[PDB]
Design a protein around this nucleic acid. Structure first.
Lengths: 192, 192
DNA sequence: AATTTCACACCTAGGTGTGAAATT
DNA sequence: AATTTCACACCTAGGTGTGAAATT
DNA sequence: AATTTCACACCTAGGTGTGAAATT
DNA sequence: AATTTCACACCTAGGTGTGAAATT
């Protein structure tokens, strides 16, 4: 039941300790290393919902002194928002999840909360805050009673080694390097 | 506490008795009479998630003989079908919900499950099935132990007088009429 | 200063036709 | 020679960071 | 036959600037 | 002696169903 492992787990540790940074943009920008993993403990020909939402870890504004992330200003001071990203290939068979990684390699991030009457499905984030991706797998039934006090599955998965900071441009220069090497669209800039 | 009433309430009943029909299309089509209502029982400086998802009412295929909706084939279902639709202006303060108008007037519906690597956010439905709009209000707290501050939320609302059938083109002709008089984009076609 | 946007050189990801080469 | 297949130069379409320039 | 797509005449919905228009 | 107000033509941009035509 419920076994959700992380693939690329090493890569997340690598970006984590040196405090992770995702660049956000008006047009949109994908996560790197884009959240991507593995699930088990499910029923094969039953099927399920998979979307991810990036929740906010705390209220505070942030800044980069002397290569150090530090709080600034004061709380203003929500807790998610966030705008969901449901797998392009969800819903789909329980077994179909287990046949593959569940990659979110195209999830985009941005700064336009007036996102062009939508036609987006991309997370819209504010620069310089600390967030945390969270993925759920709500299971979906047929047949609809009155019920009582119970409304499981009330199901949520979080990875804390996937926190990050929304930045308009990279700060720590280790991270730019870390990106540059692991990013295939970025290898123009290593032989440089 | 928890009070979510329906506006267009009468309009939904008019469309209901004569078995509701929403037109779905490759490019997209917005609901009519689009899910739109009123909310209470929430706190002002708390804030909450409002998205709607259309769940599928039952497995079976459907057809219009003899001015009658009737089942066909037997169960198949690419699901319990759905695709979430979060309000363009979510998340937002409790007072902002209780404000005014929580309309879902631009929600579009369609038939491309290969929806152009998203950049859409529109429900993709199967032609000739009966579905049901359903809206949830997930509220978001402070504090993340394992796992309660103590506070986490478990909340979903359904409207049954809002079922419908996805059609590529209208069947019953009273509904085609019912739309024409009540739809402001459709008044080319009535004093005729 | 702090932050954000911009054009741009540099790359991947994936689809076609050509002139050379295989192989019949 | 007829016929088939093919690396490679050639395409679109888009993701990366850079350093300058705009903007708060 | 059953279903889906298509250009089209007819409308809303909304942002600009014109020629007309009263008035500190 | 212009500067305020103002109805309106006009624009895009997009939403509706219709009847005919394509595609299953």
């Amino acid at each position: 039941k419920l076994r959700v492992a992380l693939s690329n787990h090493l890569l997340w540790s690598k970006f984590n300790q040196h405090q992770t940074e995702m660049i956000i943009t008006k047009q949109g920008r994908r996560m790197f290393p884009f959240l991507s993993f593995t699930v088990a403990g499910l029923e094969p020909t039953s099927h399920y919902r998979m979307f991810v939402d990036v929740v906010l870890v705390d209220q505070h504004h942030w800044r980069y002194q002397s290569g150090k992330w530090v709080q600034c200003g004061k709380a203003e001071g929500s807790m998610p928002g966030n705008r969901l990203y449901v797998h392009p290939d969800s819903p789909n068979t329980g077994a179909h999840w287990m046949r593959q990684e569940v990659s979110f390699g195209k999830l985009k991030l941005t700064n336009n909360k007036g996102a062009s009457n939508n036609v987006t499905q991309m997370i819209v984030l504010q620069s310089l805050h600390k967030y945390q991706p969270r993925l759920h797998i709500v299971e979906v039934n047929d047949g609809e009673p009155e019920a009582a006090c119970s409304a499981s599955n009330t199901h949520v998965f979080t990875f804390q080694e996937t926190q990050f900071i929304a930045v308009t441009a990279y700060q720590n220069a280790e991270i730019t390097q870390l990106k540059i090497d692991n990013n295939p669209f970025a290898k123009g800039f290593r032989e440089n």
